[PDB]
């Protein structure tokens, strides 16, 4: 029980807990304490023996090798006693009264039963990682215990703890299935039949264009077959390229990744899970410590509470048509396929295919597919996923909740373990009785609506009755910010990168988008490869062969192009949409030419937030890693009120067949004997970053710098002068939007100024220099011989009654289709979107946005700034805008220049790495990283600054939330302070140095860094935390004039990597670092980083916001440009550093003092002259 | 001890241990010295005494267009059964004894009021079974058809100046809806039919009472017979539904409009330290209300105050003009061109959410029942003959953002302007321009005008009408639907929903004892119609959820091509998928206004906080008040919407609840929680297709809680910039089998449910976890 | 208990034979002891 | 305890830096807690 000097403080990597500020009657601190002994080798423990007999063998070894405790400190930070469970000889529980209230005297201490707590032998050797205190019950605390194994996870043998990806020539495409599907000659009756005639029923307009396709579905009578089932029709089959090219987890996963322990294993092996022990503590008493209840955090309590749709995640509510479309397109099926997220599956990558989806698929008779059958692939909660959900306790009333940590305990370079839900231990009868449960965040966040945020809108955070959106977090913490309970950190959104669908015949030329949909490329960012997209991602396989040749430009199914999109004219709508009337047993595929770019695609088929809860008709997939910042105010009394078990109804299940699925409703009345709807509105409000939307946000992204450089994305301070990466203001040319599309009712509608001028941005299209307001139909898409598209052709015309036969296309079109296009007037031509902006914020802070590369720094393959990069000739190939391959939402050249890939921004001697839009021969490019290894899971301690503000360490930045609790008009609501240590910024494992962040007595949050604690990588390509398997890009030679008038055309890139040796070498982070002059430590010290000095008026951007004279985006760009040299005024700056001697391990924080490593404890000068009168006198 | 209403006249008290007090079942109708035709309408507790509202099923009221005393009870056939408010007290067990008895006499009528009433016409009440297509009426004449005539196209540009529609870009803008078809419109002396058309654009006789009684009623009776053998292809029989919303009958035939107006107008009760206030129900409009001074003599006649005399604050001066300019035409020139706007009256009827009292203040809320003029010419003749003159008043796309600028926008102030406009790659039904604004630049100011030709100014008769829904224009067109579902959004960088200021208007406010005394003086004024002024009121555009209709999935500026299609643009086209016990998905409903004092402490020296909640189609609304002034909560910035109103969407669980079965709203002072009790036994016995109902058993209870940062909590919260909200959540108390008697809120931690499954009573004790219930089977005694 | 608002009492009577104050045994059918609480008899 | 005539107290001081009450840790050798027993120390 006595303080053991050999045990010093420490911080657990998953929750960043080091010590608890104890308040009330007996204040002080409860901090973690451990033996810092070396001479430990896990190698001795030999691997036949399965994962579990081996782990207990490691446990028994570690038990006699490591010592852990939670020592209590007084208010002055002086230690008092130890509490070491392993050294506890004959422990005791509290003597409870007649009402369960423990017997206690302030002086004598607590009454002891003499009997040891429950399951003591299994918890005896567990490591305490967190301590929380009761809000209303005095002397009541709770410890979070984990097994010693959980701490030594990465030090276990490589045969047992594996990577989810591959280790003579290197080719990134070898593990990818790229061979596009083909026409099935046998299944030619499985083609969707054109209708005979439209319906008139008070309509009038007519067209010569091909009639709509009909999709009929009839039930009839047969237990296992439907009368009609046209969504099951599939006139295509996989390619036979020396075998059937499909997803086979057996062929493709030889040494398949599987978790350390299965869900069942952890729940039955009580020493291998996490435990919560309630205990009693009164330091200035004889019996100071006593134990209470020991509760095991059972994973099955969470799994039993998962929505029913999670038992079958290789399927979704669209049923068989979407399974078929995605399957053939060599994509993952469902909403959470194990090939993308193996961390939540007990049999890991063994199940990483589209086979056995829980519903009959690929039957010899198509009208048999869609019917419910047997599955064995449900979302579960194994070892890695489980311990990531361990950390961040909160005591609210008679309950203790665990919201989980960042997942750094079990996180590998190619794996993303995160917290799926919240655990609750509800205590009863004066804490003598306890009940354990778990609730998934998917349910808890079901009530999200756009009105709850002051920042970006229509973010992919929506869901439905089947809980398809599976939010998972990298939790910072859960703390009371004044009155408001706040849960912060980063969050996994719905998928946006694979929302567009490729035309069956384009797979080979769009390798990155295929990779992404196949779980090979774990990237969450939208890549700009749009030529091969299908006009609509919801077109069934039956409609794909309608225009095989492509001469009639397939009205129902064609290559997406917003130029050949139709009018919204009443007659265009009458003739081509309203004419065809859907029934009870029939739906139509309209001859109407729909098409739009990234904004448009996402507007119709992403899980965007609405004004109503559970209103997402489409939830594509779920992101790999957390790709959004997140802070949300919770409903504390709903968390404490809600029942343990949650009951779902038949409404939360997928339809048993396609007849029942056919006339489904997005919302259904819950069963009276269910309670799942009660859990939806726990989030009251939420923030994903600064309080900005659309184009206004882009301006802020330019204003922030890149940690690796300190140089902004704007490149603004000194026509052949560099241009910004995320903004269009003063980039390109000024186009008059009154001259686009219908050219009517536009002047005061979008801009509140007379002049309807809008900056085109980089990579624009103009008729000529003189003609910059609208481009006439002279970027008219032609198709392969007898090529040109014909407006004024019989089909492309609508004749109303009276015979004025007019064409349906637009006379002029917007002046840009680049990855930067931002049209307020045309959503169909906008590429820049809110989901990308959210990801682009987090990524730029981590400094991990990839750049598109043509030329490495090597000899006979260099990129020269002069004569090769023309900033004035942005309209042409001279500007070097790829238009294919790069990150959507930015200007690839502007990013390379910022990254100092070319230029003097990173290396004095130009590294000559870059991209050249070739007018000579076919281009061959690859996306590469920055050289930085920051991860979106690099989320530290939640630090409450004041009653209205909070913040945490995110990568190399300390982010502060100024305007969330109580928002102020005109402020951005965020502060950013960057770390100064170049060795940490450029480290291979940069977050291994982070040792916790705390709020200081002076009122500023500070963070501990120990660069000596930096872990080195264990290792043709070498795996690092930011390593991504980017696929090659091959495009035709770029035009010299009128370059970007059309969507950039790719070519087959399946045999292209063989000539990219130099480029492919830059996929490994260490090889980028070397070229940038960051090769090796060329240094540091271990101390404490303090935030930027902030005043109440810091962040006041009100002057830059609003106005009609210049649009809000234009006024903020001029404002940020007038504040480039005083960024501290906006709240963007560098953190100050104080050097600290020795090795930083943790901090001991009391309500009076914060002592690093618990050093510097004093008597306190104020109360030295105050004492008691001795009892004798 | 808690009181329970056993039936329509008996009341039984229970101890806090959920046990009934023996010899406590009291017959208050008998006690109040009232006959068998009376039943208890509403009950409330003030100054420890029970105040009860009673209304007779046997009431008969007549309207005589001629004479001084026009609105009167029918003495002759024992129909002189006015409504009463009685004060009862415990003289001890429980032994009730009558203290005071107040009678609610019919309203007094002036010479000016009676000129509107003479030709006032009223829409047949909306039912549980009323469809979007029943409500739909055939579109009226377009602007250029009224002022210019037929075949006067591309002559608009040159002729619009003379008709004072200078620079008006909408010749094709609708002027209203035709009254020759659709839902019945009846005089106060006339009676409403039990039939409702399935398609109002085709079936129905509108205001033509004569054409219905002579030929159409007989077709209706043949198609839709009562109990079925019927075809039901043209009409719906809603006798059972009408009866369930309080419609009084002479066997099969309903009593005249005036009788229905009276019976429904005496539905809700509020009590203060000096006054007793009586208002109507949520089902049909209320043209008046009662203010009874508690000091009134034993046999004195307590008269109601007209809503047409109660001037409310609509938020802004422009907001009030919008409602008034559409009430009618204001230039008699004729002689009998009497409507509300001309006779200088205000909004004449409201669909009342409810009424309550906190700290001697009265709180009311409700939707404004649509009211417009209409032509009655009867012949060449006027172009607007047999048609209502209503239009869309939705803010223009080019308008300045910020609440104040959106609602004060001059778009559709004097006449119609909205339609269908093609914008870039999408469209809108709202006019893109206002003021000097055009697509070319500036062309001179845009003018609007009342749809009456100036040549036919004298030979035109514009009288008054009142609708049964918060919808002013029912004309079967695009804009009608976007105004009803809230689908009009601007296109500027910062999106905003463009509000209407005549259609789906939610009115709410707090009334002082002096504001109530003013109201009393206006009721007792003889000769001139005396005007009242309620200062602490506000209005807000509250539409139905768009997702209650099939075909609409989001609310943004950009509109998909399929959304310009007739099937999802007109009323008759639109299909409902609303689960809240209503066949329509176009008209909004509100009910259960209840206010309460916040149990959570406030900063020292500051008065305790109190707010109100009310249920609307799609969510819960919270009304925020400043206790230090007993006014509606407000903030400095005009760009932000009045902080006195907050709305929070429902989930599928709360949306599932049939809003027409609302029984009682309660509030727990110690919890700060509202219990909304829905009794399924309040369902009509038959559909509109006379098919027997099979879900009129059981109950449901919704809990409503405060959310957000509340006023005067600390130094920072002395002022607010965000409206504190509410949260509706299905409590967990529900049944499909048992028939509910009442719910006892036994404690903060416990609740008791009294019900019968098979005659015998059963006391169910539920465990309460801060608004969330789970049944305790152990607590069975 | 002031917080719980519970009162535990024992009824007593003065016996004529013996001047002593004897407890009323039939007072609650279980004995002379009884409790007075609101709804938190839910124990 | 009224019968035992014993008083158990904890000394608290108002801190200037953090404007709230903190216990005087050095009040007795053991801590801020002390008893006032009338020779019922056995």
Author numbering:
A (entry chain B): 59 to 105, 108 to 227, 232 to 782, 789 to 1089, 1097 to 1159, 1164 to 1258
B (entry chain A): 27 to 118, 121 to 255, 261 to 412, 416 to 817
C (entry chain H): 1308 to 1350
D (entry chain B): 1308 to 1349
Text lifted from the article:
This complex is formed by two heterodimers, each consisting of proteins P110 and P1401–6.
Crystals were obtained from the extracellular region of P140 (residues 23–1351), both alone and in complex with the N-terminal domain of P110 (P110N: residues 23–827). The structure of P140, for which there are no molecular models or experimental phases available, was determined by density modification techniques, starting with a mask derived from the sub-tomogram-averaged map of the whole Nap obtained by cryo-electron tomography (cryo-ET). With four heterodimers in the asymmetric unit, the P140–P110N crystals were refined at 2.65 Å resolution to a final model with agreement R and Rfree factors of 18.7 and 22.4, respectively. The binding site for the sialylated oligosaccharides, identified in the structure of P1106, is located at the interface between P140 and P110 in the crystal structure of the P140–P110N complex. Interaction of the two subunits changes the position of the sialic binding β-hairpin while the interfering loop (P140 residues 807–827) inserts into the binding pocket of P110N, sterically interfering with the binding of oligosaccharides to the complex. The structure of the P140–P110N complex suggests that P110 residues Gln460–Asp461, from the binding β-hairpin, and Arg600, close to the receptor-binding site, play an important role in the interaction with P140. P110 variants carrying an R600A substitution or the triple substitution RQD (R600A, Q460A, and D461A) were introduced by transposon delivery into an M. genitalium P110 null mutant. The variant protein P110-R600A was well expressed, but the strain presented no capacity for adherence and characterization of cell motility was not feasible. The “closed” conformation corresponds to a state in which the tight interaction of the extracellular regions of P140 and P110 occlude the cell receptor-binding site.
